[PDB]
Ligand binder design. Structure first.
Ligand SMILES: Cn1cc(-c2cnc3c(-c4csc(C(=O)N[C@H]5CCCC[C@H]5N)c4)cnn3c2)cn1
Length: 305
């Protein structure tokens, strides 16, 4: 029945140059899941570093709006990251279909995005490469941030000004800039900076002047100004941005705060027993959850949600 572990591969839903993503079915539960398959035999050093960083990141993130990791399968030649499947697909697709989002809907999505990126930042993680393909949707139209493994058509229009001026290109401030671009695209359905070429693009970014769409609220535009600051050391933190008026319109008793991760349940008597009857030991279930092993036992545990 299965192609790898407990998974019947179904359909390629994404191709990168060094990685394929497949839609697949867990067999014991029959849930749909995303499998990232990386051929390590093709990868050079920087690629390999990038990959092991990805695995590190994925094992740690536990957010409603970032794709969740279920299992890692390692062989010498090939690595598999089994993660959550977002059936809504790319937010890019959605924009092309229905045009720009009304500020109400953009806000709902953007509160999610900001929550997720600031969560990462809390854990001293910066994505450094937020572009359109990183924003996916679940079936209820929730945001799902995807891919921390960098896998040049998408990149440039989301690049912070530092890139083009030789300055260091690390730090949460990079992501803050990208969030501005993303915001602009949600409400306008287009990019703040584009060019017919790389120099055009670079001049427009270094200038940092986007053009204001006539239909756009002044509240939105004050939000934009908080993200798209040229000087990296003068850009706000997402924690500060969270307090923003536009961020909170319609949540007047529900301001946006940093995500508080809920305490772990590695001892669900319900699921545990169902796995003892399914052929696992209790010491092995607990040891896998607490050792946070992301093994076959852990995958089954989480997938019974
Ligand atoms: C209807 N519909 C649903 C989907 C769709 C596409 N991709 C995904 C993923 C995903 C997890 S890691 C990853 C990735 O790293 N991709 C990389 C490899 C593939 C190329 C892009 C890269 N960012 C993608 C999860 N759910 N999901 C759903 C698409 N259409």
């Amino acid at each position: 029945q299965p192609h790898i572990g407990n998974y019947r591969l179904l359909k390629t839903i994404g191709k990168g140059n060094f990685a394929k993503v497949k839609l697949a079915r867990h067999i014991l539960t029959g849930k749909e899941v995303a499998v990232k398959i990386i051929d390590k035999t093709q990868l050079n050093s920087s690629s390999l570093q990038k990959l092991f960083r990805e695995v590190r990141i994925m094992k740690v993130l536990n957010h409603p709006n970032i794709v969740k990791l279920f299992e890692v399968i390692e062989t010498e030649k090939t690595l598999y990251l089994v993660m959550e499947y977002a059936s809504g697909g790319e937010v890019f697709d959605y924009l092309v279909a229905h045009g720009r989002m009304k500020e109400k809907e953009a806000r709902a999505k953007f509160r999610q995005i900001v929550s997720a990126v600031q969560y990462c930042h809390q854990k001293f993680i910066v994505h450094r490469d937020l572009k359109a393909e990183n924003l996916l949707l679940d079936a209820d139209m929730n945001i799902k941030i995807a891919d921390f493994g960098f896998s040049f058509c998408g990149s440039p229009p989301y690049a912070a000004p530092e890139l083009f001026q030789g300055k260091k290109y690390d730090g949460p401030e990079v992501d803050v800039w990208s969030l501005g671009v993303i915001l602009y695209t949600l409400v306008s359905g287009s990019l703040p900076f584009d060019g017919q070429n790389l120099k055009e693009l670079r001049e427009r970014v270094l200038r940092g002047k986007y053009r204001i769409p006539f239909y756009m609220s002044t509240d939105c535009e004050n939000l934009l100004k908080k993200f798209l600051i040229l000087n990296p050391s003068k850009r706000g933190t997402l924690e500060q941005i969270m307090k923003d008026r536009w961020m909170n319109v319609g949540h007047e008793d529900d301001e946006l705060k940093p995500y508080v991760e809920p305490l772990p349940d590695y001892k669900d008597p319900r699921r545990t027993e169902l796995m003892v009857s399914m052929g696992y030991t209790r010491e092995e279930i607990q040891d896998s959850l607490v050792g946070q092993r992301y093994n076959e036992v852990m995958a089954t545990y989480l997938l019974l949600g």
